[PDB]
Amino acid sequence: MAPIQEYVGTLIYVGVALFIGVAALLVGALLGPKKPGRAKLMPYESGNDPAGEVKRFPVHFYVVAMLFILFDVEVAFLWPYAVSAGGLGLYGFLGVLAFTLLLFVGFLYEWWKGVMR
Template structure:
């Protein structure tokens, strides 16, 4: 592959950077800015915020969310294997079985460590 093939990608990155910067600067100078105390109040779903915000989420919540994302992304890696299943034959089946086995070991490890418990 020649260097000219990458010129399109470079041109795209340069154009996107210039366009994004230009639009942000134009927006800053064109839009009116008249902040009032009412405009600076938090607002959600049409209901003014009366009570203080809820307590912070515990780190366990983030751990479960991260585990969900990890296992969800890992499941996406099985899609190309399923598409090329006929071409891969036994070798592809063994590789996918090992992959799913490793995922199962990771899930069991997290389960044993209590990462999936809410209490």
């Protein structure tokens, strides 16, 4: 085990940080002049409309996102190995290499094919 106390201590901390956050925002929010909407409906640039209509966006963003998940799964697995690594011995290392090369093959496919397409 290890102290559950210190995980609690995180929760406390989160409660403090969130509080000071919200506190600042609520001061700011409540004070200020106002003139009701009738033209603050509009956003940046050229009056209304910031730039035309864009309807669709490239696959670029999908690809980048997708990479990150699969390789994040990699990292997840490589943490246990990082910790105990004199106990797992030489056989350990071979386990690691096998796994690594497999995800690296993944990599080489997406690299030789591209991250702008």
